[PDB]
mmCIF file of C-alpha atoms in Angstrom:
data_model
loop_
_atom_site.group_PDB
_atom_site.id
_atom_site.type_symbol
_atom_site.label_atom_id
_atom_site.label_comp_id
_atom_site.label_asym_id
_atom_site.label_seq_id
_atom_site.Cartn_x
_atom_site.Cartn_y
_atom_site.Cartn_z
ATOM 1 C CA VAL A 1 -15.915 -23.507 33.886
ATOM 2 C CA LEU A 2 -12.148 -23.155 34.251
ATOM 3 C CA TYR A 3 -11.245 -26.776 35.097
ATOM 4 C CA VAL A 4 -7.667 -25.974 36.108
ATOM 5 C CA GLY A 5 -7.446 -29.460 37.528
ATOM 6 C CA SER A 6 -10.248 -31.477 35.917
ATOM 7 C CA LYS A 7 -10.806 -35.251 35.946
ATOM 8 C CA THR A 8 -7.211 -36.504 35.859
ATOM 9 C CA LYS A 9 -5.346 -39.680 36.789
ATOM 10 C CA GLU A 10 -1.636 -39.469 37.583
ATOM 11 C CA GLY A 11 0.552 -41.875 39.511
ATOM 12 C CA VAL A 12 -2.054 -44.632 39.315
ATOM 13 C CA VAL A 13 -1.970 -48.425 38.977
ATOM 14 C CA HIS A 14 -5.138 -50.408 38.424
ATOM 15 C CA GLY A 15 -6.229 -53.788 37.139
ATOM 16 C CA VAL A 16 -3.232 -55.974 37.973
ATOM 17 C CA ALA A 17 -3.448 -59.756 38.320
ATOM 18 C CA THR A 18 -0.316 -61.619 39.340
ATOM 19 C CA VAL A 19 0.625 -65.198 40.217
ATOM 20 C CA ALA A 20 4.013 -66.248 41.611
ATOM 21 C CA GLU A 21 4.866 -69.888 42.332
ATOM 22 C CA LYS A 22 8.365 -70.336 43.767
ATOM 23 C CA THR A 23 9.446 -73.471 45.612
ATOM 24 C CA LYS A 24 12.522 -71.766 47.099
ATOM 25 C CA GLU A 25 13.597 -68.132 47.357
ATOM 26 C CA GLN A 26 16.608 -66.913 49.349
ATOM 27 C CA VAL A 27 18.216 -63.514 49.891
ATOM 28 C CA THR A 28 21.635 -63.242 51.547
ATOM 29 C CA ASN A 29 22.941 -59.773 52.372
ATOM 30 C CA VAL A 30 26.247 -58.807 53.992
ATOM 31 C CA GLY A 31 26.342 -55.022 54.086
ATOM 32 C CA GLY A 32 24.895 -52.755 51.421
ATOM 33 C CA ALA A 33 21.264 -53.004 50.361
ATOM 34 C CA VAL A 34 18.841 -55.387 48.660
ATOM 35 C CA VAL A 35 15.360 -54.522 47.371
ATOM 36 C CA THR A 36 13.222 -57.294 45.915
ATOM 37 C CA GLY A 37 9.596 -57.937 45.053
ATOM 38 C CA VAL A 38 7.965 -54.541 44.527
ATOM 39 C CA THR A 39 4.613 -54.783 42.747
ATOM 40 C CA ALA A 40 1.606 -52.508 42.190
ATOM 41 C CA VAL A 41 3.084 -49.346 43.704
ATOM 42 C CA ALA A 42 2.008 -45.784 42.928
ATOM 43 C CA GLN A 43 3.420 -42.476 44.135
ATOM 44 C CA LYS A 44 3.081 -38.784 43.421
ATOM 45 C CA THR A 45 5.427 -36.113 44.754
ATOM 46 C CA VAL A 46 5.217 -32.326 44.548
ATOM 47 C CA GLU A 47 8.520 -30.496 45.060
ATOM 48 C CA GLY A 48 10.499 -33.532 46.178
ATOM 49 C CA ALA A 49 12.671 -36.394 45.001
ATOM 50 C CA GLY A 50 10.633 -39.585 44.655
ATOM 51 C CA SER A 51 12.311 -42.992 44.669
ATOM 52 C CA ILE A 52 10.271 -46.173 44.408
ATOM 53 C CA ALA A 53 12.727 -49.071 44.783
ATOM 54 C CA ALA A 54 16.166 -47.509 45.177
ATOM 55 C CA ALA A 55 18.872 -49.595 46.829
ATOM 56 C CA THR A 56 21.916 -47.495 47.704
ATOM 57 C CA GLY A 57 25.209 -48.627 49.117
ATOM 58 C CA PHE A 58 27.596 -47.357 51.774
ATOM 59 C CA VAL A 59 27.245 -43.551 51.930
ATOM 60 C CA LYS A 60 30.501 -42.488 53.590
ATOM 61 C CA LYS A 61 31.824 -38.994 54.304
ATOM 62 C CA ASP A 62 35.240 -38.888 55.993
ATOM 63 C CA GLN A 63 37.133 -35.738 56.951
ATOM 64 C CA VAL B 1 -17.493 -23.230 38.479
ATOM 65 C CA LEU B 2 -13.723 -22.924 38.847
ATOM 66 C CA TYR B 3 -12.860 -26.560 39.674
ATOM 67 C CA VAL B 4 -9.274 -25.804 40.690
ATOM 68 C CA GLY B 5 -9.095 -29.300 42.089
ATOM 69 C CA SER B 6 -11.917 -31.277 40.466
ATOM 70 C CA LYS B 7 -12.517 -35.043 40.472
ATOM 71 C CA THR B 8 -8.938 -36.336 40.380
ATOM 72 C CA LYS B 9 -7.109 -39.540 41.293
ATOM 73 C CA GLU B 10 -3.397 -39.375 42.088
ATOM 74 C CA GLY B 11 -1.237 -41.816 44.004
ATOM 75 C CA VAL B 12 -3.874 -44.542 43.790
ATOM 76 C CA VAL B 13 -3.834 -48.334 43.430
ATOM 77 C CA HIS B 14 -7.023 -50.278 42.866
ATOM 78 C CA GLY B 15 -8.152 -53.637 41.560
ATOM 79 C CA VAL B 16 -5.180 -55.862 42.383
ATOM 80 C CA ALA B 17 -5.438 -59.644 42.707
ATOM 81 C CA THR B 18 -2.328 -61.548 43.718
ATOM 82 C CA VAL B 19 -1.427 -65.141 44.574
ATOM 83 C CA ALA B 20 1.947 -66.239 45.963
ATOM 84 C CA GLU B 21 2.758 -69.893 46.664
ATOM 85 C CA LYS B 22 6.251 -70.387 48.096
ATOM 86 C CA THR B 23 7.296 -73.545 49.925
ATOM 87 C CA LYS B 24 10.391 -71.884 51.423
ATOM 88 C CA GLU B 25 11.508 -68.265 51.702
ATOM 89 C CA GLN B 26 14.531 -67.090 53.703
ATOM 90 C CA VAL B 27 16.176 -63.714 54.264
ATOM 91 C CA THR B 28 19.597 -63.491 55.923
ATOM 92 C CA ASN B 29 20.943 -60.040 56.769
ATOM 93 C CA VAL B 30 24.259 -59.121 58.394
ATOM 94 C CA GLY B 31 24.396 -55.338 58.511
ATOM 95 C CA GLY B 32 22.975 -53.039 55.859
ATOM 96 C CA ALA B 33 19.343 -53.241 54.795
ATOM 97 C CA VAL B 34 16.894 -55.586 53.081
ATOM 98 C CA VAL B 35 13.423 -54.675 51.796
ATOM 99 C CA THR B 36 11.255 -57.414 50.322
ATOM 100 C CA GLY B 37 7.622 -58.012 49.456
ATOM 101 C CA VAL B 38 6.030 -54.594 48.949
ATOM 102 C CA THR B 39 2.677 -54.788 47.166
ATOM 103 C CA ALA B 40 -0.305 -52.475 46.621
ATOM 104 C CA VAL B 41 1.207 -49.340 48.154
ATOM 105 C CA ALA B 42 0.172 -45.762 47.399
ATOM 106 C CA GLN B 43 1.621 -42.476 48.625
ATOM 107 C CA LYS B 44 1.325 -38.777 47.933
ATOM 108 C CA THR B 45 3.700 -36.140 49.281
ATOM 109 C CA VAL B 46 3.533 -32.350 49.098
ATOM 110 C CA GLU B 47 6.855 -30.561 49.621
ATOM 111 C CA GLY B 48 8.801 -33.624 50.723
ATOM 112 C CA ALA B 49 10.940 -36.504 49.529
ATOM 113 C CA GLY B 50 8.867 -39.671 49.164
ATOM 114 C CA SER B 51 10.506 -43.095 49.159
ATOM 115 C CA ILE B 52 8.431 -46.252 48.879
ATOM 116 C CA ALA B 53 10.854 -49.180 49.238
ATOM 117 C CA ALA B 54 14.310 -47.659 49.642
ATOM 118 C CA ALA B 55 16.991 -49.785 51.283
ATOM 119 C CA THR B 56 20.058 -47.725 52.171
ATOM 120 C CA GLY B 57 23.338 -48.903 53.579
ATOM 121 C CA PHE B 58 25.737 -47.675 56.244
ATOM 122 C CA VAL B 59 25.429 -43.867 56.421
ATOM 123 C CA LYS B 60 28.696 -42.850 58.088
ATOM 124 C CA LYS B 61 30.060 -39.374 58.824
ATOM 125 C CA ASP B 62 33.476 -39.317 60.515
ATOM 126 C CA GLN B 63 35.404 -36.194 61.491
ATOM 127 C CA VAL C 1 -19.012 -22.935 43.034
ATOM 128 C CA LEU C 2 -15.239 -22.678 43.406
ATOM 129 C CA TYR C 3 -14.423 -26.329 44.213
ATOM 130 C CA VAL C 4 -10.828 -25.625 45.235
ATOM 131 C CA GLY C 5 -10.694 -29.130 46.618
ATOM 132 C CA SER C 6 -13.541 -31.062 44.983
ATOM 133 C CA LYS C 7 -14.190 -34.820 44.968
ATOM 134 C CA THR C 8 -10.627 -36.159 44.872
ATOM 135 C CA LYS C 9 -8.840 -39.390 45.769
ATOM 136 C CA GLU C 10 -5.127 -39.277 46.568
ATOM 137 C CA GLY C 11 -3.000 -41.755 48.472
ATOM 138 C CA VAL C 12 -5.671 -44.446 48.243
ATOM 139 C CA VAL C 13 -5.679 -48.237 47.863
ATOM 140 C CA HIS C 14 -8.892 -50.136 47.286
ATOM 141 C CA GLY C 15 -10.063 -53.474 45.962
ATOM 142 C CA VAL C 16 -7.121 -55.742 46.776
ATOM 143 C CA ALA C 17 -7.428 -59.521 47.080
ATOM 144 C CA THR C 18 -4.343 -61.470 48.083
ATOM 145 C CA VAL C 19 -3.489 -65.079 48.922
ATOM 146 C CA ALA C 20 -0.131 -66.226 50.307
ATOM 147 C CA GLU C 21 0.633 -69.894 50.989
ATOM 148 C CA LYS C 22 4.120 -70.441 52.421
ATOM 149 C CA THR C 23 5.122 -73.621 54.234
ATOM 150 C CA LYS C 24 8.236 -72.009 55.742
ATOM 151 C CA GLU C 25 9.399 -68.404 56.041
ATOM 152 C CA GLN C 26 12.437 -67.280 58.050
ATOM 153 C CA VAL C 27 14.125 -63.926 58.630
ATOM 154 C CA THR C 28 17.547 -63.756 60.292
ATOM 155 C CA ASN C 29 18.935 -60.328 61.156
ATOM 156 C CA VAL C 30 22.263 -59.459 62.789
ATOM 157 C CA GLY C 31 22.449 -55.680 62.925
ATOM 158 C CA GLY C 32 21.059 -53.349 60.283
ATOM 159 C CA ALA C 33 17.425 -53.499 59.217
ATOM 160 C CA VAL C 34 14.948 -55.803 57.489
ATOM 161 C CA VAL C 35 11.489 -54.841 56.207
ATOM 162 C CA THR C 36 9.287 -57.545 54.717
ATOM 163 C CA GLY C 37 5.648 -58.091 53.845
ATOM 164 C CA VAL C 38 4.100 -54.651 53.355
ATOM 165 C CA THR C 39 0.745 -54.792 51.570
ATOM 166 C CA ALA C 40 -2.205 -52.439 51.035
ATOM 167 C CA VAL C 41 -0.655 -49.331 52.585
ATOM 168 C CA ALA C 42 -1.643 -45.736 51.848
ATOM 169 C CA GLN C 43 -0.153 -42.477 53.091
ATOM 170 C CA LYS C 44 -0.401 -38.770 52.418
ATOM 171 C CA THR C 45 2.007 -36.170 53.782
ATOM 172 C CA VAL C 46 1.888 -32.378 53.618
ATOM 173 C CA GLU C 47 5.233 -30.633 54.152
ATOM 174 C CA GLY C 48 7.138 -33.728 55.240
ATOM 175 C CA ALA C 49 9.241 -36.629 54.032
ATOM 176 C CA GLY C 50 7.127 -39.766 53.650
ATOM 177 C CA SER C 51 8.723 -43.212 53.628
ATOM 178 C CA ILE C 52 6.607 -46.339 53.330
ATOM 179 C CA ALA C 53 8.992 -49.300 53.675
ATOM 180 C CA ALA C 54 12.468 -47.826 54.089
ATOM 181 C CA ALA C 55 15.120 -49.995 55.721
ATOM 182 C CA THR C 56 18.214 -47.979 56.622
ATOM 183 C CA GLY C 57 21.476 -49.205 58.026
ATOM 184 C CA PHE C 58 23.889 -48.023 60.698
ATOM 185 C CA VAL C 59 23.630 -44.211 60.895
ATOM 186 C CA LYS C 60 26.908 -43.245 62.570
ATOM 187 C CA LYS C 61 28.315 -39.792 63.324
ATOM 188 C CA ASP C 62 31.731 -39.787 65.017
ATOM 189 C CA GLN C 63 33.699 -36.694 66.012
ATOM 190 C CA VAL D 1 2.353 -100.836 52.537
ATOM 191 C CA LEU D 2 -0.379 -101.181 49.920
ATOM 192 C CA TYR D 3 -1.463 -97.521 49.635
ATOM 193 C CA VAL D 4 -4.583 -98.279 47.596
ATOM 194 C CA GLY D 5 -5.665 -94.720 48.209
ATOM 195 C CA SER D 6 -2.542 -92.785 49.221
ATOM 196 C CA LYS D 7 -2.049 -89.014 49.515
ATOM 197 C CA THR D 8 -4.263 -87.782 46.672
ATOM 198 C CA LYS D 9 -6.051 -84.565 45.728
ATOM 199 C CA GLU D 10 -9.067 -84.745 43.425
ATOM 200 C CA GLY D 11 -11.854 -82.244 42.910
ATOM 201 C CA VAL D 12 -9.905 -79.492 44.659
ATOM 202 C CA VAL D 13 -9.547 -75.724 44.226
ATOM 203 C CA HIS D 14 -6.995 -73.764 46.203
ATOM 204 C CA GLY D 15 -5.173 -70.458 46.069
ATOM 205 C CA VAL D 16 -7.662 -68.239 44.240
ATOM 206 C CA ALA D 17 -7.633 -64.443 44.479
ATOM 207 C CA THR D 18 -10.363 -62.537 42.680
ATOM 208 C CA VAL D 19 -11.496 -58.918 42.389
ATOM 209 C CA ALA D 20 -14.708 -57.804 40.670
ATOM 210 C CA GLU D 21 -15.663 -54.132 40.343
ATOM 211 C CA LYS D 22 -19.003 -53.619 38.588
ATOM 212 C CA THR D 23 -20.981 -50.389 38.836
ATOM 213 C CA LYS D 24 -24.173 -52.019 37.523
ATOM 214 C CA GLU D 25 -25.214 -55.637 37.014
ATOM 215 C CA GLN D 26 -28.731 -56.753 36.058
ATOM 216 C CA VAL D 27 -30.321 -60.123 35.319
ATOM 217 C CA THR D 28 -33.807 -60.313 33.797
ATOM 218 C CA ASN D 29 -35.421 -63.736 33.474
ATOM 219 C CA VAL D 30 -38.835 -64.623 32.041
ATOM 220 C CA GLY D 31 -39.121 -68.396 32.180
ATOM 221 C CA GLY D 32 -36.247 -70.804 31.648
ATOM 222 C CA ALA D 33 -33.078 -70.601 33.716
ATOM 223 C CA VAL D 34 -30.120 -68.309 34.367
ATOM 224 C CA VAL D 35 -26.918 -69.232 36.220
ATOM 225 C CA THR D 36 -24.312 -66.538 36.795
ATOM 226 C CA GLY D 37 -21.281 -65.930 38.973
ATOM 227 C CA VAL D 38 -19.961 -69.344 40.010
ATOM 228 C CA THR D 39 -16.425 -69.190 41.401
ATOM 229 C CA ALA D 40 -14.144 -71.481 43.420
ATOM 230 C CA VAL D 41 -16.382 -74.558 43.401
ATOM 231 C CA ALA D 42 -15.239 -78.154 43.858
ATOM 232 C CA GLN D 43 -17.204 -81.394 43.694
ATOM 233 C CA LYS D 44 -16.592 -85.119 43.636
ATOM 234 C CA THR D 45 -19.234 -87.720 42.818
ATOM 235 C CA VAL D 46 -19.095 -91.511 42.995
ATOM 236 C CA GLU D 47 -21.698 -93.323 40.883
ATOM 237 C CA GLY D 48 -23.709 -90.236 39.979
ATOM 238 C CA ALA D 49 -24.105 -87.453 37.450
ATOM 239 C CA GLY D 50 -22.392 -84.279 38.653
ATOM 240 C CA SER D 51 -23.353 -80.883 37.248
ATOM 241 C CA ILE D 52 -21.704 -77.716 38.507
ATOM 242 C CA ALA D 53 -23.463 -74.809 36.766
ATOM 243 C CA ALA D 54 -26.055 -76.360 34.462
ATOM 244 C CA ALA D 55 -28.981 -74.195 33.389
ATOM 245 C CA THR D 56 -31.705 -76.253 31.719
ATOM 246 C CA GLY D 57 -34.867 -75.056 30.081
ATOM 247 C CA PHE D 58 -38.486 -76.184 30.032
ATOM 248 C CA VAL D 59 -38.531 -79.973 30.550
ATOM 249 C CA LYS D 60 -41.945 -80.955 29.188
ATOM 250 C CA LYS D 61 -43.488 -84.408 28.780
ATOM 251 C CA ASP D 62 -46.992 -84.431 27.275
ATOM 252 C CA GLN D 63 -49.075 -87.530 26.577
ATOM 253 C CA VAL E 1 4.842 -100.790 48.421
ATOM 254 C CA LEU E 2 2.113 -101.185 45.805
ATOM 255 C CA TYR E 3 0.985 -97.541 45.498
ATOM 256 C CA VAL E 4 -2.126 -98.350 43.465
ATOM 257 C CA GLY E 5 -3.250 -94.800 44.055
ATOM 258 C CA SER E 6 -0.152 -92.821 45.054
ATOM 259 C CA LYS E 7 0.294 -89.043 45.323
ATOM 260 C CA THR E 8 -1.934 -87.856 42.473
ATOM 261 C CA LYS E 9 -3.761 -84.667 41.509
ATOM 262 C CA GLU E 10 -6.775 -84.900 39.207
ATOM 263 C CA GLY E 11 -9.594 -82.436 38.677
ATOM 264 C CA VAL E 12 -7.678 -79.650 40.408
ATOM 265 C CA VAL E 13 -7.367 -75.880 39.950
ATOM 266 C CA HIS E 14 -4.838 -73.875 41.914
ATOM 267 C CA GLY E 15 -3.057 -70.549 41.759
ATOM 268 C CA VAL E 16 -5.573 -68.373 39.916
ATOM 269 C CA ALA E 17 -5.590 -64.574 40.130
ATOM 270 C CA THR E 18 -8.344 -62.714 38.320
ATOM 271 C CA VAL E 19 -9.521 -59.113 38.005
ATOM 272 C CA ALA E 20 -12.746 -58.048 36.280
ATOM 273 C CA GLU E 21 -13.745 -54.390 35.930
ATOM 274 C CA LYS E 22 -17.092 -53.929 34.171
ATOM 275 C CA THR E 23 -19.110 -50.722 34.399
ATOM 276 C CA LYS E 24 -22.282 -52.399 33.096
ATOM 277 C CA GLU E 25 -23.278 -56.032 32.611
ATOM 278 C CA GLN E 26 -26.780 -57.198 31.663
ATOM 279 C CA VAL E 27 -28.329 -60.591 30.945
ATOM 280 C CA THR E 28 -31.813 -60.835 29.425
ATOM 281 C CA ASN E 29 -33.386 -64.280 29.124
ATOM 282 C CA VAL E 30 -36.788 -65.216 27.697
ATOM 283 C CA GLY E 31 -37.028 -68.993 27.861
ATOM 284 C CA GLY E 32 -34.125 -71.369 27.344
ATOM 285 C CA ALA E 33 -30.958 -71.114 29.410
ATOM 286 C CA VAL E 34 -28.028 -68.782 30.048
ATOM 287 C CA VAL E 35 -24.815 -69.652 31.905
ATOM 288 C CA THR E 36 -22.242 -66.923 32.462
ATOM 289 C CA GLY E 37 -19.219 -66.264 34.636
ATOM 290 C CA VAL E 38 -17.858 -69.656 35.694
ATOM 291 C CA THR E 39 -14.324 -69.449 37.084
ATOM 292 C CA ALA E 40 -12.015 -71.698 39.118
ATOM 293 C CA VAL E 41 -14.214 -74.803 39.118
ATOM 294 C CA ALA E 42 -13.027 -78.380 39.599
ATOM 295 C CA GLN E 43 -14.954 -81.646 39.455
ATOM 296 C CA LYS E 44 -14.296 -85.364 39.421
ATOM 297 C CA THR E 45 -16.904 -88.003 38.620
ATOM 298 C CA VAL E 46 -16.719 -91.790 38.821
ATOM 299 C CA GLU E 47 -19.301 -93.647 36.722
ATOM 300 C CA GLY E 48 -21.350 -90.592 35.797
ATOM 301 C CA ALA E 49 -21.780 -87.830 33.252
ATOM 302 C CA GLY E 50 -20.106 -84.627 34.432
ATOM 303 C CA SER E 51 -21.107 -81.253 33.007
ATOM 304 C CA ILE E 52 -19.498 -78.056 34.246
ATOM 305 C CA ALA E 53 -21.293 -75.184 32.484
ATOM 306 C CA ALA E 54 -23.865 -76.782 30.193
ATOM 307 C CA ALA E 55 -26.817 -74.659 29.106
ATOM 308 C CA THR E 56 -29.515 -76.761 27.450
ATOM 309 C CA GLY E 57 -32.693 -75.613 25.803
ATOM 310 C CA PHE E 58 -36.297 -76.785 25.764
ATOM 311 C CA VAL E 59 -36.295 -80.571 26.306
ATOM 312 C CA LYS E 60 -39.698 -81.603 24.949
ATOM 313 C CA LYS E 61 -41.199 -85.078 24.564
ATOM 314 C CA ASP E 62 -44.702 -85.154 23.060
ATOM 315 C CA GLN E 63 -46.746 -88.282 22.382
ATOM 316 C CA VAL F 1 7.320 -100.768 44.235
ATOM 317 C CA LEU F 2 4.596 -101.207 41.623
ATOM 318 C CA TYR F 3 3.426 -97.579 41.298
ATOM 319 C CA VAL F 4 0.324 -98.434 39.270
ATOM 320 C CA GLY F 5 -0.842 -94.895 39.844
ATOM 321 C CA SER F 6 2.233 -92.875 40.831
ATOM 322 C CA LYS F 7 2.635 -89.089 41.082
ATOM 323 C CA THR F 8 0.392 -87.943 38.226
ATOM 324 C CA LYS F 9 -1.472 -84.782 37.248
ATOM 325 C CA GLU F 10 -4.485 -85.060 34.948
ATOM 326 C CA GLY F 11 -7.331 -82.631 34.406
ATOM 327 C CA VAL F 12 -5.448 -79.814 36.123
ATOM 328 C CA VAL F 13 -5.181 -76.044 35.648
ATOM 329 C CA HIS F 14 -2.676 -74.000 37.601
ATOM 330 C CA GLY F 15 -0.934 -70.654 37.429
ATOM 331 C CA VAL F 16 -3.476 -68.516 35.576
ATOM 332 C CA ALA F 17 -3.537 -64.718 35.772
ATOM 333 C CA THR F 18 -6.313 -62.899 33.953
ATOM 334 C CA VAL F 19 -7.532 -59.312 33.622
ATOM 335 C CA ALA F 20 -10.771 -58.294 31.892
ATOM 336 C CA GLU F 21 -11.812 -54.650 31.524
ATOM 337 C CA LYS F 22 -15.166 -54.236 29.766
ATOM 338 C CA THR F 23 -17.220 -51.053 29.978
ATOM 339 C CA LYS F 24 -20.374 -52.773 28.684
ATOM 340 C CA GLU F 25 -21.327 -56.421 28.217
ATOM 341 C CA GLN F 26 -24.815 -57.632 27.276
ATOM 342 C CA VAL F 27 -26.324 -61.047 26.576
ATOM 343 C CA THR F 28 -29.806 -61.338 25.057
ATOM 344 C CA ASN F 29 -31.338 -64.802 24.773
ATOM 345 C CA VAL F 30 -34.730 -65.787 23.353
ATOM 346 C CA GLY F 31 -34.924 -69.563 23.534
ATOM 347 C CA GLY F 32 -31.995 -71.908 23.028
ATOM 348 C CA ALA F 33 -28.831 -71.606 25.093
ATOM 349 C CA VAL F 34 -25.927 -69.236 25.717
ATOM 350 C CA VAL F 35 -22.704 -70.061 27.577
ATOM 351 C CA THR F 36 -20.163 -67.299 28.121
ATOM 352 C CA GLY F 37 -17.147 -66.594 30.290
ATOM 353 C CA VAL F 38 -15.746 -69.964 31.364
ATOM 354 C CA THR F 39 -12.214 -69.709 32.753
ATOM 355 C CA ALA F 40 -9.879 -71.921 34.797
ATOM 356 C CA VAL F 41 -12.041 -75.051 34.812
ATOM 357 C CA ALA F 42 -10.812 -78.613 35.310
ATOM 358 C CA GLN F 43 -12.700 -81.901 35.184
ATOM 359 C CA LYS F 44 -11.998 -85.611 35.168
ATOM 360 C CA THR F 45 -14.577 -88.284 34.380
ATOM 361 C CA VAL F 46 -14.347 -92.069 34.599
ATOM 362 C CA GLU F 47 -16.907 -93.965 32.510
ATOM 363 C CA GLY F 48 -18.991 -90.939 31.571
ATOM 364 C CA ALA F 49 -19.455 -88.195 29.012
ATOM 365 C CA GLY F 50 -17.818 -84.966 30.176
ATOM 366 C CA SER F 51 -18.860 -81.612 28.736
ATOM 367 C CA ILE F 52 -17.287 -78.390 29.958
ATOM 368 C CA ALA F 53 -19.116 -75.547 28.184
ATOM 369 C CA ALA F 54 -21.670 -77.186 25.900
ATOM 370 C CA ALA F 55 -24.648 -75.104 24.803
ATOM 371 C CA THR F 56 -27.321 -77.246 23.159
ATOM 372 C CA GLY F 57 -30.513 -76.144 21.508
ATOM 373 C CA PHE F 58 -34.103 -77.358 21.475
ATOM 374 C CA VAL F 59 -34.058 -81.141 22.036
ATOM 375 C CA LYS F 60 -37.448 -82.219 20.685
ATOM 376 C CA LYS F 61 -38.907 -85.712 20.317
ATOM 377 C CA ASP F 62 -42.409 -85.838 18.815
ATOM 378 C CA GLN F 63 -44.417 -88.992 18.153
#
């Protein structure tokens, strides 16, 4: 018995109950980015950059 | 018994109950990006960049 | 018994119950990108960049 | 326009999301009654006795 | 316009999200009554006795 | 416009989110009554006796 990786739990979501009552919901975007309504998300990365809900703007490079 | 990778659980979502009552819901986009309504998502990456709900804008490169 | 990869669970979604009542739902796009309504999605990548719901804008390269 | 019975809603269940993870579940009965696991039930009675989940025991009448 | 019964809502359940994780669950009954696990139930009665989850015992009548 | 019964809401349950994690749960009954786990229940009665979760014992009548 070495158990280098034994019974683990990483990057895990469980047992989520959610209600959302909304009569009106609007999103208006003119350029850029909008991220809305992220729920019950799990991720695991090995040797990388992990972004869950990352809104980024204009990425310009002018020479 | 070495169990290098034994009984694990990574990048996992389980047991999610969700209700969403919305009489109206609009999204208006003019250029750029919009990400909405991501639920119960799981991902695992090995040697890579993992993005779940990533809205990015204009990626320009001018020379 | 070496069990290098034993009984594992990665990039997994299970046991999801979802209700969505919406009388009206509109999406208006004029250029760019829109991603909406992603639910119960699982992915695993090995040596790659994994994106689940990634809206990206104008990717220009001018010389 | 009299609208004696207009747009009503009585004895109604709507928009229910439910998850139930149970590895083991036993019921042992020796006489009597057992009622278990009633979900999302609606009833309307007019001039009567309405019982949804009513477990009753030995109803004896000896003379 | 009299609207004796106009737009009403009585005996109504809506928008319920529920999760239940139970590794073991036992019920042992020896005579009598047991009522368990009633969820999202609606009832309306007119001129009657309404019981939702009513466990009653031995109803004896001896003469 | 008389609006004897206008837009009302009576005996109503809405917008309930519930999680319940229980590794073990036992009920042992020997005669009598047991009522457990009633959630999100609505009732309306007109000219009657309304009981939601009413456990009653031995109802004897001896002559």
